[PDB]
Write a protein that binds this ligand. Sequence first.
Ligand SMILES: CC(=O)c1cc(-c2cc(C(=O)NC3CC3)ccc2C)c2ncccn12
Length: 126
Amino acid sequence: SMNPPPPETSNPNKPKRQTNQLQYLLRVVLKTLWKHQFAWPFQQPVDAVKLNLPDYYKIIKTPMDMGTIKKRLENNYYWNAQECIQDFNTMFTNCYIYNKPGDDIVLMAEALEKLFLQKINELPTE
Ligand SMILES: CC(=O)c1cc(-c2cc(C(=O)NC3CC3)ccc2C)c2ncccn12
């Protein structure tokens, strides 16, 4: 089996900004989720070869992971916070699409998503 190339984390012709909302997404949101006991399945792209999930990238056509999001934030890849929030939501949604309800990995995603929602509830204005 083969994995696909990972999502891009740098693109010199993509316009970039560093806003206070994006700084919050790195310093508060990403850092809170990254240190969590349940973060580890989400800290890198799914290696469907090593995990013996040959159908993963047949089902998941918009992969996303926190390793990618971390690199994007540290590279100032984004223009606005909504782009980054969409990446997080894609990662959670992919987990719920691929896995069975009640699987341990789904419980892990739900726990991270609850914290995610609590932090973005206080996303600073501007
Ligand atoms: C997000 C998702 O659905 C998901 C993630 C994992 C997962 C991936 C890795 C991994 O790829 N590590 C790379 C370094 C080699 C490791 C451990 C786990 C539990 C998983 N395993 C079974 C079903 C679903 N998943």
